[PDB]
Design an enzyme around this catalytic site. Structure first.
Site, PDB file in Angstrom:
ATOM      1  N   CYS A  82       0.696  -1.094  -0.177  1.00  0.00           N
ATOM      2  CA  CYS A  82       0.367   0.149   0.543  1.00  0.00           C
ATOM      3  C   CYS A  82       0.989   0.775  -0.450  1.00  0.00           C
ATOM      4  O   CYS A  82       1.623   1.134   0.930  1.00  0.00           O
ATOM      5  CB  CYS A  82      -0.552  -0.334   1.079  1.00  0.00           C
ATOM      6  SG  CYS A  82      -1.869   1.137   0.942  1.00  0.00           S
ATOM      7  N   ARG A 138      -0.525   4.294   2.876  1.00  0.00           N
ATOM      8  CA  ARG A 138      -0.596   4.023   4.238  1.00  0.00           C
ATOM      9  C   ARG A 138      -0.015   4.770   5.117  1.00  0.00           C
ATOM     10  O   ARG A 138       0.358   5.139   6.352  1.00  0.00           O
ATOM     11  CB  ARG A 138       0.778   3.308   4.392  1.00  0.00           C
ATOM     12  CG  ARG A 138      -0.003   2.031   4.081  1.00  0.00           C
ATOM     13  CD  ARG A 138       1.469   0.635   4.381  1.00  0.00           C
ATOM     14  NE  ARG A 138       2.432   0.575   3.726  1.00  0.00           N
ATOM     15  CZ  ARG A 138       3.805  -0.031   3.585  1.00  0.00           C
ATOM     16  NH1 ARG A 138       2.781  -1.297   4.835  1.00  0.00           N
ATOM     17  NH2 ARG A 138       4.377  -0.086   2.533  1.00  0.00           N
ATOM     18  N   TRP A 162      -9.449   5.617  -1.592  1.00  0.00           N
ATOM     19  CA  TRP A 162      -9.779   6.553  -2.923  1.00  0.00           C
ATOM     20  C   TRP A 162      -8.576   6.109  -3.589  1.00  0.00           C
ATOM     21  O   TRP A 162      -7.615   5.546  -3.562  1.00  0.00           O
ATOM     22  CB  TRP A 162     -10.509   7.948  -1.935  1.00  0.00           C
ATOM     23  CG  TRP A 162      -8.788   8.230  -1.810  1.00  0.00           C
ATOM     24  CD1 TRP A 162      -7.661   8.752  -2.226  1.00  0.00           C
ATOM     25  CD2 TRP A 162      -8.797   8.843  -0.031  1.00  0.00           C
ATOM     26  NE1 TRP A 162      -6.194   8.899  -1.687  1.00  0.00           N
ATOM     27  CE2 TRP A 162      -7.415   9.315  -0.149  1.00  0.00           C
ATOM     28  CE3 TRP A 162      -9.271   8.437   1.038  1.00  0.00           C
ATOM     29  CZ2 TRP A 162      -6.719   9.938   1.320  1.00  0.00           C
ATOM     30  CZ3 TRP A 162      -9.043   9.186   1.988  1.00  0.00           C
ATOM     31  CH2 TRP A 162      -7.675   9.658   2.207  1.00  0.00           C
ATOM     32  N   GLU A 190      -5.009   3.832 -10.973  1.00  0.00           N
ATOM     33  CA  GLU A 190      -5.366   2.752 -11.240  1.00  0.00           C
ATOM     34  C   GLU A 190      -6.422   2.410 -12.216  1.00  0.00           C
ATOM     35  O   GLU A 190      -6.635   1.272 -13.043  1.00  0.00           O
ATOM     36  CB  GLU A 190      -5.912   2.436  -9.484  1.00  0.00           C
ATOM     37  CG  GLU A 190      -5.083   2.465  -8.395  1.00  0.00           C
ATOM     38  CD  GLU A 190      -5.874   2.225  -7.263  1.00  0.00           C
ATOM     39  OE1 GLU A 190      -6.024   0.930  -6.737  1.00  0.00           O
ATOM     40  OE2 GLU A 190      -6.288   2.998  -6.482  1.00  0.00           O
TER      41      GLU A 190
HETATM   42  C1  HEM Z   1      -6.743   6.064   1.397  1.00  0.00           C
HETATM   43  C2  HEM Z   1      -7.160   5.587   0.164  1.00  0.00           C
HETATM   44  C3  HEM Z   1      -5.770   4.509  -0.192  1.00  0.00           C
HETATM   45  C4  HEM Z   1      -5.191   5.022  -1.470  1.00  0.00           C
HETATM   46  C5  HEM Z   1      -5.088   6.230  -2.325  1.00  0.00           C
HETATM   47  C6  HEM Z   1      -4.186   3.809  -2.040  1.00  0.00           C
HETATM   48  C7  HEM Z   1      -3.285   3.130  -2.317  1.00  0.00           C
HETATM   49  C8  HEM Z   1      -3.600   1.706  -2.676  1.00  0.00           C
HETATM   50  C9  HEM Z   1      -3.402   1.549  -3.677  1.00  0.00           C
HETATM   51  C10 HEM Z   1      -2.865   2.065  -5.512  1.00  0.00           C
HETATM   52  C11 HEM Z   1      -3.238  -0.060  -4.171  1.00  0.00           C
HETATM   53  C12 HEM Z   1      -2.946  -1.516  -4.941  1.00  0.00           C
HETATM   54  C13 HEM Z   1      -4.023  -0.989  -5.786  1.00  0.00           C
HETATM   55  C14 HEM Z   1      -3.576  -2.441  -7.236  1.00  0.00           C
HETATM   56  O1  HEM Z   1      -2.924  -2.427  -7.493  1.00  0.00           O
HETATM   57  O2  HEM Z   1      -4.355  -3.001  -6.671  1.00  0.00           O
HETATM   58  C15 HEM Z   1      -3.527  -0.218  -2.638  1.00  0.00           C
HETATM   59  C16 HEM Z   1      -3.110  -1.548  -2.420  1.00  0.00           C
HETATM   60  C17 HEM Z   1      -2.813  -1.761  -0.822  1.00  0.00           C
HETATM   61  N1  HEM Z   1      -3.855  -1.069  -0.252  1.00  0.00           N
HETATM   62 FE1  HEM Z   1      -4.029   0.321   0.072  1.00  0.00          FE
HETATM   63  N2  HEM Z   1      -4.742   2.811  -0.142  1.00  0.00           N
HETATM   64  C18 HEM Z   1      -5.718   3.372   0.612  1.00  0.00           C
HETATM   65  C19 HEM Z   1      -6.191   2.750   1.477  1.00  0.00           C
HETATM   66  C20 HEM Z   1      -6.134   1.698   1.922  1.00  0.00           C
HETATM   67  C21 HEM Z   1      -6.933   1.173   3.485  1.00  0.00           C
HETATM   68  C22 HEM Z   1      -8.219   1.892   4.206  1.00  0.00           C
HETATM   69  C23 HEM Z   1      -6.680  -0.188   3.357  1.00  0.00           C
HETATM   70  C24 HEM Z   1      -6.806  -0.512   4.767  1.00  0.00           C
HETATM   71  C25 HEM Z   1      -7.804  -0.355   5.796  1.00  0.00           C
HETATM   72  C26 HEM Z   1      -5.464  -0.388   2.632  1.00  0.00           C
HETATM   73  C27 HEM Z   1      -4.620  -1.539   2.391  1.00  0.00           C
HETATM   74  C28 HEM Z   1      -4.629  -2.127   1.206  1.00  0.00           C
HETATM   75  C29 HEM Z   1      -3.542  -3.168   0.979  1.00  0.00           C
HETATM   76  C30 HEM Z   1      -4.408  -4.270   1.789  1.00  0.00           C
HETATM   77  C31 HEM Z   1      -3.168  -3.494  -0.506  1.00  0.00           C
HETATM   78  C32 HEM Z   1      -3.434  -4.597  -1.119  1.00  0.00           C
HETATM   79  C33 HEM Z   1      -4.588  -5.190  -1.912  1.00  0.00           C
HETATM   80  C34 HEM Z   1      -3.610  -5.928  -2.062  1.00  0.00           C
HETATM   81  O3  HEM Z   1      -2.384  -7.476  -2.147  1.00  0.00           O
HETATM   82  O4  HEM Z   1      -4.452  -6.662  -3.452  1.00  0.00           O
HETATM   83  N3  HEM Z   1      -5.722   0.908   2.091  1.00  0.00           N
HETATM   84  N4  HEM Z   1      -3.064   0.507  -2.445  1.00  0.00           N
HETATM   85  C1  LIG Z   2      -9.775  -0.698  -0.774  1.00  0.00           C
HETATM   86  C2  LIG Z   2      -9.784   0.474  -0.558  1.00  0.00           C
HETATM   87  C3  LIG Z   2      -7.631   0.230  -1.364  1.00  0.00           C
HETATM   88  N1  LIG Z   2      -7.153   1.909  -2.247  1.00  0.00           N
HETATM   89  C4  LIG Z   2      -6.970   1.431  -3.392  1.00  0.00           C
HETATM   90  N2  LIG Z   2      -7.061   2.368  -3.885  1.00  0.00           N
HETATM   91  N3  LIG Z   2      -7.078   0.612  -4.281  1.00  0.00           N
HETATM   92  C5  LIG Z   2      -7.450  -0.930  -3.668  1.00  0.00           C
HETATM   93  C6  LIG Z   2      -7.267  -1.250  -5.380  1.00  0.00           C
HETATM   94  C7  LIG Z   2      -8.074  -1.049  -6.665  1.00  0.00           C
HETATM   95  C8  LIG Z   2      -8.242  -1.599  -7.757  1.00  0.00           C
HETATM   96  N4  LIG Z   2      -6.713  -1.485  -7.635  1.00  0.00           N
HETATM   97  C9  LIG Z   2      -9.392  -1.331  -8.898  1.00  0.00           C
HETATM   98  O1  LIG Z   2      -8.446  -0.429  -9.980  1.00  0.00           O
HETATM   99  O2  LIG Z   2     -10.554  -1.267  -8.920  1.00  0.00           O
END
Ligand code: HEM
Ligand SMILES: C=CC/[NH+]=C(/N)NCCC[C@H](N)C(=O)O
Ligand code: HEM
Ligand SMILES: C[C@H](O)[C@H](O)[C@H]1CNc2nc(N)[nH]c(=O)c2N1
Ligand SMILES: C[C@H](O)[C@H](O)[C@H]1CNc2nc(N)[nH]c(=O)c2N1
Ligand SMILES: C=CC/[NH+]=C(/N)NCCC[C@H](N)C(=O)O
Ligand SMILES: [Zn+2]
Lengths: 407, 410
Positions: free
Chosen positions: B108, B111, B280, B285
C-alpha cells in the site's frame, strides 16, 4: 524441484528447474526480501573450474568423453602448479556468451548468443589496452549498424596486477561541478571527471564532453587516452513535430559500453572486460535525460511545450516524458543508428524468456530492472512473474578502482 | 541487527530494525528471490502466543506494557481461549489491529493515512441481509457525497471454519463482465467468472458495459445471497478530456469508491474472513490498469485512433502518448465532480515522507517495490529511486481462496 511462474495477462505458466543450479546468495532470506536493493584459492578454484568445464562439455554433447576428462585433469594439474589456469579460446567464448545469458538484469538477452568476443589476454600495457578498446569501439559501432561485443583483458592473478578500465562506460560525457553549486554536463560522472582533470586531462568544460579513457594495466597507475573522435558516433536529438526541440541542445552517444564490471568464468576473474550492444530508448530519454540526478530536462521541455506546470495532476511531467522519448527514438532512427524501444525490447524478452524455459528450464530475471521506467504496465514483462537467482559464468559489480588502487 | 536502505536520488539512507519482529515467510530463500510473484481452523496452542504477542503490542502502544491492566487481560484472554478455544477482542483492540493491519500493508502506497480510519464493528451480524445493511451503511459513510473517508466493516471472526462469513465480490462495487459466443468480452473481463456465478444465482444482468454488479453475501457459513446496492449510493464519474471533446463520446465512466472485499484480516491470531475496506483511488489504477490493461477494458486502440497518431510502428510511442491523456482524463473528471482521488506523483511523494517518518518512529516500513511503484512514469516518481525492505508484520491483510472454490453448499 519445480517452481511455477505465471503471466497474468496471458495466463501462461512456466516451470523453473534451472534455479536448482543456483550457487551464490541473493541478499534475501525467508524473513526479508531485498529485491529492490541496488547491490546486496587452489581448493576454492578447482571445484569452480570443474563445475564450469562440465557445463561446457555438457553443452557441446561430450559430457564424460576422454576430451572432457583430459581437460578436467589438465586444468587440475595446472591449478596444482600455477595456482590458476588459462581458458582455451572456445571456453572463453562460451564463458562470455553465458555470463550474458545469465545477466538477470538484461532485457536484451534474446541476443545472448550473437556476441563478438575479442581475446585481449595477450595485452600488457595501457597503450595496448587503448589499441584494443579502439578496435572494439569501431567493430561495434559499425557505422551506425551496431554489433554486440566484448574485449577481455588478462585475468586476475594476485590482485596486485589487476587490469582495470576506470570509466564506467567507454563513452560518457564529463561532469563538472561549478562554484555556483549547480552541475554542468553529467552529474553521474562528476567524481570521475575530477579524477581525469587531476590526472592531467584538460576539460573543455562543455555540457556533452566525451570523457577520456583511464586505463590501468598489470596493476600499474592508470593512463589517459582520447578515443579517436571519428570513432565516437553521436546522435543529435530532434523532435518529429517540435521544430523548437533541436534548440534544446541535446545529443547522446550511440554506443552503450559498460566497462566497470567483472567477468567470472570457471572461477577466474576478469577485472577488465568492456562489453557493448545497443540502447533501449528509455535508457537515455527517461533515465539519462529526466532522472533528477542526471540531465534533469523535464522543466525545460515542459516549459517549451507550454503546459500547466502549476499542479501535478496535469501530468505535465508525463506528457513531456513521452515527447522526449519520441525524439530520442526518432533521432537515432533517422541517422540509422541501432536502437530499440521499450515495447519491442520487452516483447522480445518475453519470447526469449519463453524459449529459455523450454530449452534451459528457466531464465533468471530481476523484475525491478527488466520493466522499463515508463509505461511499465503496458509492456508485457510487467505482467510476467520472474524468478531471480545467480548463475555462473557471470557479470558482477566491483569496487571503483580509485577506491582501492595502491598507487 | 541493522539494515540499510538507500535512495539513489537524494542519497538518503535509513536503518531498519523493525524487520527483526518479522514473523512469517516471504517466499524467498537465500538462493532465490520471488519478489515479483503475485502470491507465494487454527489450534488452541497456536492461538495464545499470537494473542499474547498482539496484546503486548497493543499495550506497549498505549504506554501500559506490564501494567496490571496489561496482565489481567493477558490472563483473561488466556483463560477464555482455554475454555472456548478462541477469544473476543475488545473494541479498542479491534480498532488498533485494523489500523495496524493497514499500517503493515507492504503493497500500500497510501499508508500515510493508516491512522485516519473509521472502523465499523459488524461482529454482531448474523445473516446475509444483515451484512447487506452493514455494507450499505459503509458505502454511504465512505462515499460522503464525493469526499471519501477511509473505513472498514468487520464481520464475525472465523471459528470452526465452517461458519465463515464471506463477501464473494472482490470489491463492493464493480462492473460486470460478460463473455459472448462471439468470443469477445463485454464489460470487465476481470469479473466474467464472478458475473456468471451471480447470473447462475438469480441475478438478471442488464448485459451493459458498466453494470454495477450485485452483492453476493455469505453469513455464518450458509449459502450466499443476492442484493442490489441502492443506486443512489453508488457514486460514479463519467470520464471526459479537458481538451478532447470527443473523449466523452468514448462512453467511459467509473465508480468513485474502491473497496476491497475478498481479503482476510488477521488480529491476534484471530481470522476475519469478511472485512471489506475502502479508501480512495490513485489515478493510475483506473487510468492505466483498469482501462488500458490488455485484459481489461483495453481502450488504447480507440483513444489512439481518435487521437490520430502513427500506429504503424511502435517506436512512435502512440501507446505511451494515448495513456498519458487517458490518465489526464481520469484525474480531470474526478476533480470536476469533486470526487476525491490522488495522482501517482502526489501519492508516491507522500509515501516517501510517510516512509521516512515510519523509520524514525517505528524503525522500518515494510514495502513491496514491485507494487508501490506506479504502472506508468515509474522513474519520475520518488519511490522508484527508493530501496525498500519487504517483510510481513501482523496484524495483517492476507489473500484467501475464492469462496466459490471452497464453499460447501447446502
Ligand atoms: C486512502 C486511500 C488509499 C489509497 C490511495 C491507497 C492506494 C493503494 C493502491 C494504489 C494499491 C494497489 C492497488 C492495486 O494495484 O490493485 C493499494 C493496495 C493496498 N492497500 Fe491501499 N490505499 C488506500 C487505502 C487503504 C485502506 C484504507 C486499507 C486498509 C484498511 C489499505 C490496504 C491496502 C492493501 C491490503 C493493499 C494491497 C491489496 C492487494 O494486495 O491486492 N489501503 N492501496
Ligand atoms: C480499498 C481501498 C484500497 N485503495 C485503493 N486505492 N485501491 C484498491 C484496489 C482497487 C483496484 N486497483 C481497482 O482499480 O479497482
Ligand atoms: C543487444 C543490445 C542490448 C540491449 C538492448 C540490452 C539492454 C539492457 C538494459 C536496458 C539494461 C539496463 C541498463 C540500466 O538500466 O543501466 C541492461 C543491463 C545489462 N546488460 Fe544488457 N543489453 C544489450 C546487450 C548486452 C550485452 C552485449 C551484454 C553482455 C555481454 C549485456 C549485459 C548486461 C548486464 C551485465 C547488465 C546489467 C548491468 C548492471 O547491473 O548495471 N547486455 N541491458
Ligand atoms: C532503488 C531501485 O532499486 C533502483 O531505483 C533501480 C530500480 N530499477 C532499475 N532498473 C533499471 N533498468 N535500471 C536502474 O538503474 C534501476 N534502478
Ligand atoms: C507479475 C507482477 O508481479 C504483477 O504484474 C504485479 C506487478 N506490480 C503490481 N503493482 C500493483 N500496484 N498492482 C498489480 O496488480 C501489480 N501486478
Ligand atoms: C553495454 C551494453 C548494455 N546495453 C545497454 N543498453 N545499456 C547498459 C547501461 C547503459 C546506461 N543505462 C545508459 O543509459 O548509458
Ligand atoms: Zn526477494
Amino acid at each position: 524441484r519445480f517452481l511455477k511462474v505465471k503471466n497474468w495477462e496471458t495466463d501462461v505458466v512456466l516451470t523453473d528447474t534451472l534455479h536448482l543450479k543456483s550457487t551464490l546468495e541473493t541478499g534475501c532470506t525467508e524473513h526479508i526480501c531485498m529485491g529492490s536493493i541496488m547491490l546486496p584459492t587452489k581448493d576454492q578454484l578447482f571445484p569452480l573450474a570443474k563445475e564450469f568445464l562440465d557445463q561446457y562439455y555438457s553443452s557441446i554433447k561430450r559430457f564424460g568423453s576422454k576430451a572432457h576428462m583430459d581437460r578436467l585433469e589438465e586444468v587440475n594439474k595446472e591449478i596444482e602448479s600455477t595456482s590458476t589456469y588459462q581458458l582455451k579460446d572456445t571456453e572463453l567464448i562460451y564463458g562470455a556468451k553465458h555470463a550474458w545469458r545469465n545477466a538477470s538484469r538484461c532485457v536484451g538477452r534474446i541476443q545472448w548468443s550473437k556476441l563478438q568476443v575479442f581475446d585481449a589476454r595477450d595485452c600488457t600495457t595501457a597503450h595496448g589496452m587503448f589499441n584494443y578498446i579502439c578496435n572494439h569501439v569501431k567493430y561495434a559501432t559499425n557505422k551506425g549498424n551496431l554489433r554486440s561485443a566484448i574485449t577481455i583483458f588478462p585475468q586476475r592473478t594476485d590482485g596486485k596486477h589487476d587490469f582495470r578500465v576506470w570509466n564506467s562506460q567507454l563513452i560518457r560525457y564529463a561532469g563538472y561541478k561549478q562554484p555556483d553549486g549547480s552541475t554542468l554536463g553529467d552529474p553521474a560522472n562528476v567524481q570521475f571527471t575530477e579524477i581525469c582533470i587531476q590526472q592531467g586531462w584538460k576539460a573543455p568544460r562543455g555540457r556533452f564532453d566525451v570523457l577520456p579513457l583511464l586505463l590501468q594495466a598489470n596493476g600499474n597507475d592508470p593512463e589517459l587516452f582520447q578515443i579517436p573522435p571519428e570513432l565516437v558516433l553521436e546522435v543529435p536529438i530532434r523532435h518529429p513535430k517540435f521544430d523548437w526541440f533541436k534548440d534544446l541542445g541535446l545529443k547522446w552517444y550511440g554506443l552503450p559500453a559498460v566497462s566497470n564490471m567483472l567477468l567470472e568464468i570457471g572461477g577466474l576473474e576478469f577485472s577488465a572486460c568492456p562489453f557493448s550492444g545497443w540502447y533501449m530508448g528509455t535508457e537515455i530519454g527517461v533515465r539519462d535525460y529526466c532522472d533528477n540526478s542526471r540531465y534533469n530536462i523535464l522543466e525545460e521541455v515542459a516549459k517549451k511545450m507550454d503546459l500547466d506546470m502549476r499542479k501535478t495532476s496535469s501530468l505535465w511531467k508525463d506528457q513531456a516524458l513521452v515527447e522526449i522519448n519520441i525524439a530520442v527514438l526518432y533521432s537515432f532512427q533517422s541517422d540509422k543508428v541501432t536502437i530499440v524501444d521499450h515495447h519491442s525490447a520487452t516483447e522480445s524478452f518475453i519470447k526469449h524468456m519463453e524459449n529459455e524455459y523450454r530449452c534451459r528450464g528457466g531464465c533468471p530475471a530481476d523484475w525491478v530492472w527488466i520493466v522499463p521506467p515508463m509505461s511499465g504496465s503496458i509492456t508485457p514483462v510487467f505482467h510476467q512473474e520472474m524468478l531471480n537467482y545467480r548463475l555462473t559464468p557471470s557479470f558482477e559489480y566491483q569496487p571503483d578502482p580509485w577506491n582501492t588502487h595502491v598507487w
